[PDB]
Design a protein around this ligand. Sequence first.
Ligand SMILES: [Fe+3]
Ligand SMILES: [Fe+3]
Ligand SMILES: [O-]
Ligand SMILES: [O-]
Ligand SMILES: [Zn+2]
Ligand SMILES: [Zn+2]
Lengths: 323, 323
Amino acid sequence: EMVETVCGPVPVEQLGKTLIHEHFLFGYPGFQGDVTRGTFREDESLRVAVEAAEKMKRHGIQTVVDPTPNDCGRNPAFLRRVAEETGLNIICATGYYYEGEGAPPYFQFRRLLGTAEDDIYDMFMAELTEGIADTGIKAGVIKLASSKGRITEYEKMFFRAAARAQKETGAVIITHTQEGTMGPEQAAYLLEHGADPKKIVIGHMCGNTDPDYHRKTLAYGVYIAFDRFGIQGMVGAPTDEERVRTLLALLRDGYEKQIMLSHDTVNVWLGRPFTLPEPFAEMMKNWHVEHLFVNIIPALKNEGIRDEVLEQMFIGNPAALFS
Amino acid sequence: EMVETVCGPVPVEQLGKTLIHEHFLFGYPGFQGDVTRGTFREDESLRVAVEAAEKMKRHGIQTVVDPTPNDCGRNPAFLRRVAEETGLNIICATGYYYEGEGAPPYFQFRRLLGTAEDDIYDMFMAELTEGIADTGIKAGVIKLASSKGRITEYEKMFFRAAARAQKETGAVIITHTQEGTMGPEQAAYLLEHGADPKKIVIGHMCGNTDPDYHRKTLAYGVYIAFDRFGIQGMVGAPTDEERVRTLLALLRDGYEKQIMLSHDTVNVWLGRPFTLPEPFAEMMKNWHVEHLFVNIIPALKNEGIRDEVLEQMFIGNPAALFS
Ligand SMILES: [Fe+3]
Ligand SMILES: [Fe+3]
Ligand SMILES: [O-]
Ligand SMILES: [O-]
Ligand SMILES: [Zn+2]
Ligand SMILES: [Zn+2]
């Protein structure tokens, strides 16, 4: 009946229209070391974040899952400020990034000590049931991530710890797949360790344009997310045109109750400001929190997708997921 | 004539007896993500650090270089507190750890943007000549590090940025070599890019037990450090007995003016507390800041090493290095 948001427990029935995957803040591991030229401008960042939140509210969004990994600048206290200000529900995560772009040296060390998996489990349990540092904010989801073409042994420690923690807490698991790979593998591995498919979201599934890969992942009974609308050119990404074509094939096949949509936006980048070169920038020009509503949804409607299906995805699915 | 310490500029002539490589705080990249169970206990940590500082002072140490990488928990403000308390000079660094155990994803990303080398350079220049964040503390050395058997392209950006910055500032460069490899390569690569051998310390040279490897590194005119006394079995390290044998061979060959000594201790570990499993842990039992003075130095003296040579290493070499 309840889910933990950054402002405390909230009835699942009150979540309403939800974006399953967006980042208010995000930094690549190592951004901390660039503190002198890349310092965190709090007031400006909160402005940007609050504005992003208001744009979502304007399209009827009431809830956001922000699955920023512990090692990528996750900041629950900041999230709580964004939420207090806007009345938005924000659910945060506990978890580490994938080994390739995460910060593995620390838990790799604890693996040599032979305590890693249990320490990770302990960390999950603590942040889900007690609180994150001294914020007294609890995570509402566990965040897992795998590398391209592989779930590494480092990554598997997290997967195994997450299944254990989900068995103990009933927590929702949300994943990152890298460049359209390992969806089926992720679902299978989690299920083999007793994870509950109705509590799992395989993320970045839109990274793969082959509907059979999707059906293979969907066969496990898990949710899948097309959560990178707007992202074009970078991190191996397909086009929105392909995202839509794939999504339409699935919806037409009756998979609406297993699909959620989002953009994976990064509203404030941690570390030093940067600008993409307009080979990529203009390809990435619709990567913002309104893109789904302004561009994608109308396109789906013009292809015969009905309001009931849209509602299933944005409202009914998150409610079922968290309950 | 001056060098930047955490308490401001200091006459090089006043540095006195110096440990070239010790860490008051250190954490493996990713420690930040374990904040809930691994929170930073400031008061206790400052105690431990101040004590470590006093033990060094008691053995006549006046200056310590703490070359903790930016991405491994470097905390200049904390260092400044340790120094204010004890009167010890502490010189800190600017630099990132090696790829394999650092946090590469951030500057790897800026490489794709094609600005990495210049941003790193910009960071060096800023921390050496302006200050680190808002602490107003400037780094006195640039820290570089390479992987086992290789200096990676990621690492080479830092090496190239450091040569540039040293040409502009005359800053001292101090390196990490991984498991006794790349000493000669590091010196060659830095020299090829116009770095000054008399301002370079190739570190962890004690990781290799073959004197010809050492002579090859020493031929570039650089300093080397045997800076891991007390560390045994772990990270591929040899024994102190081997460290001593190798060091004796070099001193007997007249290399005293190019060698410095330290322990590479980690006085406070960042992230969650741990204990090394008991067979490794006893191997590592003398890994503490008094080991050199209580155990190693008397052994060198019993092998005929004179006071003048010891003084050359602990006092004369640091003076020449920083001037
Ligand atoms: Fe994401
Ligand atoms: Fe070190
Ligand atoms: O992501
Ligand atoms: O080190
Ligand atoms: Zn992701
Ligand atoms: Zn080192």
